[PDB]
Every structure is written in C-alpha cells, then in structure tokens.
Paper text:
Bacterial type I signal peptidases (SPases) are membrane-anchored serine proteases that process the signal peptides of proteins exported via the Sec and Tat secretion systems. The type I signal peptidases (SPases) process the majority of proteins secreted by bacteria. They belong to a group of serine proteases that utilize a Ser–Lys catalytic dyad, which differs from the classical Ser–His–Asp triad found in most serine proteases and in the eukaryotic endoplasmic reticulum signal peptidase complex. The human pathogen Staphylococcus aureus has only one active type I signal peptidase, [name]. Here, the crystal structure of [name], the type I signal peptidase from the Gram-positive pathogen Staphylococcus aureus, is reported, and a peptide-tethering strategy that exploits the use of carrier-driven crystallization is described.
S. aureus [name] was expressed, purified and crystallized as an [name] fusion protein in which the N-terminal [name] was joined by a three-residue linker to the extracellular domain of [name] (residues 26–191). In the uncomplexed structure the catalytic Ser36 of [name] was mutated to Ala, but this mutation has no effect on the structure of the [name] moiety, which is essentially identical (r.m.s.d. of <0.2 Å over 153 aligned Cα atoms) in the [name]–peptide structures described later, in which residue 36 is restored to the catalytically active Ser. There are some differences in the catalytic domain ([name] residues 26–84 and 138–191), where [name] lacks one prominent β-hairpin loop and a C-terminal helix that are present in LepB, but the major differences are in the second, noncatalytic domain (residues 85–137) in [name]. This domain is much more divergent and has little sequence or structural homology, with only a small three-stranded β-sheet in common between [name] and LepB. The structure of [name], the first from a Gram-positive bacterium and the second SPase I to be crystallized, shows that the Gram-positive [name] and the Gram-negative LepB have a conserved fold despite their limited sequence identity (23%). There is little change in the peptide-binding cleft between the uncomplexed and peptide-bound [name] structures. In the uncomplexed structure Tyr30 partially occupies the S3 pocket but moves when peptides bind, and Val76, which forms a bridge between the S1 and S3 pockets, adopts an alternative rotamer. These changes are consistent with changes observed between the apo and inhibitor-bound structures of [name] LepB, with the homologous residues in [name] adopting the same positions as in LepB.
Numbering used by the authors: 12 to 407, 409 to 421, 423 to 526
Amino acid sequence: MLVIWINGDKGYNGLAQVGKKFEKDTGIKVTVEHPDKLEEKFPQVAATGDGPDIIFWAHDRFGGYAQSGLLAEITPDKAFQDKLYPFTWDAVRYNGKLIAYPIAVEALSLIYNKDLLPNPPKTWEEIPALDKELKAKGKSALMFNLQEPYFTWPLIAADGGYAFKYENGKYDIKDVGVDNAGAKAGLTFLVDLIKNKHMNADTDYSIAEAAFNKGETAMTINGPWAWSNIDTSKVNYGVTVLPTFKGQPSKPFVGVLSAGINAASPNKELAKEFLENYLLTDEGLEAVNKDKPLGAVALKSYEEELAKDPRIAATMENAQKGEIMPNIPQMSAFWYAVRTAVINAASGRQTVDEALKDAQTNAGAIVTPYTIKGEAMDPTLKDGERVAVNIVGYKTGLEKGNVVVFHANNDDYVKRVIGVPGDKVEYKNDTLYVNGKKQDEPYLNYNLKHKQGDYITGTFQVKDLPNANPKSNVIPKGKYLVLGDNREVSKDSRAFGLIDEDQIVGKVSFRFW
Ligand SMILES: OC[C@H]1O[C@H](O[C@H]2[C@H](O)[C@@H](O)[C@@H](O)O[C@@H]2CO)[C@H](O)[C@@H](O)[C@@H]1O
C-alpha cells in the first residue's frame, strides 16, 4: 500500500484515479487522504512512524521537513529531469539536494463575475467606491479568505515588503521584510477596508467561496484549484491580473505544489515509480487537473498543451510580479507571525504598527525544540518534557522569572532567572527578598507544600557566592542568579555561583496556566 496526503482544496479524487491505475498495473493499493492541518501533522506522525508515504504541499514547507530528516532525497535521472521545467526543480532544491518532485506552479489571481462587473478594477484604491455601488444593488465588491496570510500578502507586500531577503543565491534569515513602509501601507489599506465595512474580518475560505459562487459578491481572490467549483456554479467569471496598490502590482507568493517521499517509508521505490511514471505524465496530470486545476504544470509536454488557457496566462502574469516562496525552515515561523499580525490588526486587537513590529521580531526569531533532562525543575518542568527554546543572541532581554537554557564548559542546564544585573537578592530560610522587599514564587508552591526537610532553598546571600561581589548582595553587571524550581535537589547558583550573560543560550516556552 502507498498512502498519499494532499490538501483538501486540490484534486484528490483525480489523484485517486491515478492511484487506481497504479493498483491495476502493480497490484499495489494507493490510498489518498486529505486530513486537516496535514502540513502540521506530517512531522507529528513521522515522529511516530505512521505517516504517509507521499506528501503533497507547496514547496515552502519542504525545507523544514528536510532539515528534520523527514524526507528522502529524490534521484531522478537526466532523462526524467529534462521533462520538467528547470525552475520547478530549483523550488525543490534544499542544501544542494532535491527533496521533492515539482508538480505545478500556483499563484493567486483576481476572479471576477462578468455579469456583476464587466470591467474589473485596475486598482485596489477603486474598491471602496465599487463596493458602495454594489451595496446599493444588494451585493458586495470583494470577498476572499482573510484568515490565511497567503491570501492577504499580495496586497500587504505590493508597495514593499518581503519574507526573507534573497541575495547572491541564498536567503538571509536575519533580513526580514515585514516591518517596513510598504507592508504598513498595504496592511493599513486592508484594515481600512474592514474598518469601513467593505470586508468582514471573519471571512474565511468557505465563506468567500460560497459567496462568489452564488453570485453574492463580484470578486474573489483564489488559485486555479478553485475554478472547478465556479464552473459548476455557471457564474460567468474571468480570471485576471490582481489590482495595483499605490501604482504597484500586487505581490502574491508563488508556490510550487510538490510531492515528497517520507524518509521512513518502506515503499520508497514504489513511491518513485508512481510519481515519475504515473503522476508526472500527460495522462496522470490531466486526471488531477480535470478534477481541480493544477496551474502551470511542471511537466513541459502537458504545460504546453494547457498554455492556451487564458486563465493559466493570467495565473503566470500574476506570478511574474510575485515572490517565489522561500523554503528555509524559518518559513513556518514567518507564516505564523504574519497570520497573527493580520488577524490582530484586522480585529483591532493591535494597531497595524504593533502588529507588524511583533511579526517582524517573531518571523526571524529562531525557536529550537528541546527536551528537559532530569528533575531539577520538577514539577514545573518534568524529565523528558518537550519545550521550545527561543535562541537569545550574544548580549541581546532577560528578566526575573524567565526559565533559560545555559552552557558551561558540553554542559547545558535549564534553570529559572531569580536575579538579573543590578538586583539586590538574598534568602532568609525560604523567603526570597529582591531589592529589599519580598517576592512571591508561585512556581515553588507545590515543592514548598511537599518538602522533605525544613526548607527547600534555605538561607543564603549573593555576596557569599562564586562570581559575585563579596562586598554586596547586588548582582554584578552581566551576571545572573539562577535556581531550579526543585530546590531540594537542584545543583544551581547555590553550588556554582552566579553565571554570566554569555552562558545563556535561550529562553524556554512550555505548557503553563
Ligand atoms: O497562509 C499561509 C500558508 O500559505 C501557503 O499555503 C497555501 C498553499 O500554497 C495553496 O496551495 C493553497 O492550498 O492555500 C494555502 C493557504 O491557505 C503555504 O504553502 C503554507 O505553507 C502556509 O502555511
């Protein structure tokens, strides 16, 4: 059996027909599935080893999967490589290696109802007036999915703005383009459409799709996969170039639908045969495309056959003014960061400026999975517990209460920051005094109530500790007091003294409250 995952918006029935052919020829069963959140679930089920043999997604997520060792390197021969456009192979190259088979090029277009709107607008700026005109006639101008930053980026980034800077053949993770003048202008325009009742912040994919396909709204923004359902609605639609904002073309991300092979699959050779000899042929792509259109397919023979379609021409025109999605592992963080900014800006939970400031920071912030070792933070953090570590740069925002990972010599420890540079700190029995006054420690509540002896921390003062000023209990510059929540068993600053700023490598996020 080959198990294949593909997103619910794609032609999974058509893909299944190709599966039936393969079964008929080989005796091997092919099961196509379209679970929710498959792009998040894939690494989860790979960790167990009950994942799909083949996973379809846009190329952006595959860098992250490869970096985690979840994907097999693919080994097409010259003759097969030559069948696909070289730029499609570029999209599935990660650290020198091919990690997926490219299937098709996707970009969003403006889709409009010709009976409601014979002349689609050239500019985003026209849409408010157009909506007023249509509101008078019982309709609206535009509905598209506002929940996913894929759909809102074309406007957001039209006037400037990018994910990661690409230069001299590689992405710079340190150069994020979310908090800049262009994106502020675009996101502000988007928020103002909502503010002014031209769109609704709750509008998602199914709401927008239903509304356009029942003739309630004049325009939507979607990809080629959406065309089949519009064909079935008998709406008279056109697919055209996205409007300009401030005279600048919209900047959709360009995705390449790609198929990766699970590194843990026991059917890698069969997966290769299915993709190369059954799917990526004129016959196989037609089956999927007839179910839900693929876009500009990676296979030259069949792309040439479909290129006559004005809707494909429109797709690629929008793609020419777009931004190829980066495939670096950090893209996941970028998407989540931008998703949050738009929702918060659109709901008013943040101003556009707060939204983009945070998103700029979070898109570039490196987060590393970590597993807790031992009992010294028990029960706050348990042995074996999975946490997230936000890597802190050299001399870059630590506060009391932060739980941190730090080094000394191959040694790493997890402890809580109890005092930072400048803090006066001391313990009398189990009572913590910080800058003269008592500080509560709710994270010790359990261990205080279940203590073996008289006291779990016990009396001490900063002055008496290694690396402190013997003169004062005021923590010196660039130094930190760190203690384990499991005070009865923790080897911490009470044993090895104050630690240095340069020792701290990350801040720990974990399950709490
Ligand atoms: O919204 C963030 C999301 O964008 C892209 O996902 C697209 C996908 O490429 C399209 O094929 C279509 O299915 O819509 C998706 C957006 O809902 C990225 O490929 C994805 O990783 C990212 O989370």
